[PDB]
Amino acid sequence: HMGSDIDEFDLLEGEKTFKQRRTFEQRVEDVRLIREQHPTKIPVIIERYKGEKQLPVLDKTKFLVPDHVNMSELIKIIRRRLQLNANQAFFLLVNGHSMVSVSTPISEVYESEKDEDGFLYMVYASQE
């Protein structure tokens, strides 16, 4: 009888992101200030994926990255700061996906992937 006897229930259970801490206009003004005073740097927000239990949390989520730095170098930096073991899986996701081009400047990435507010958002995880 195709599991007709089985019913579903939503199980409930019992620290804010940058977008939660700052309004859109506040973020746009931050980016304006960065563009004015640090024209060769890319504003980048890096946060831990919601629900990630393997990787620790970083002490800083807001970064200025020199234009020439590529994703491989950024991954190395973040892994070092998280103090990960060499065999630990790690992914740095931009708009939910891994970047294919890991040798190109982050400014080039920025032009494709930036948020409407002008920040570039990344999330790190031990999967995806």
Author numbering: -16 to -3, 4 to 117
Authors' text:
To prove whether LIR2 interacts with the LIR-binding site in LC3, we solved two structures of an LIR2-LC3 fusion in two crystallization conditions. Both structures are identical and solved in the same space group. There are two molecules (molecule A and B) of the LIR2-LC3 fusion in one asymmetric unit with LIR2 of each molecule interacting with its symmetry-related LC3 molecule. The hydrophobic interaction of LIR2 with LC3 is conserved and adopts the classical LIR-LC3-binding mode. The first aromatic residue, F29, of LIR2 interacts with the first hydrophobic pocket (HP1) consisting of I23, P32, L53, F108 and the alkyl sidechain of K51 and the second aromatic residue L32 interacts with the second hydrophobic pocket (HP2) consisting of F52, V54, P55, V58, L63 and I66. The salt bridge interactions of residues LIR2E28 with LC3K51 and LIR2D30 with LC3R70 are observed in both structures. F52A mutation led to the reduction of LIR2 binding by about sixfold (Kd = 3.14 µM), while R70A mutation reduced binding affinity about 15-fold (Kd = 8.10 µM). No binding of the free LIR2 peptide with the LIR2-LC3 fusion protein was observed under these conditions, suggesting that the LIR2 peptide competes with the conjugated LIR2 peptide for binding to the LIR-binding site of LC3. Therefore, RavZ recognizes LC3 mainly via its N-terminal LIR2 motif by binding to the LIR-binding site in LC3.
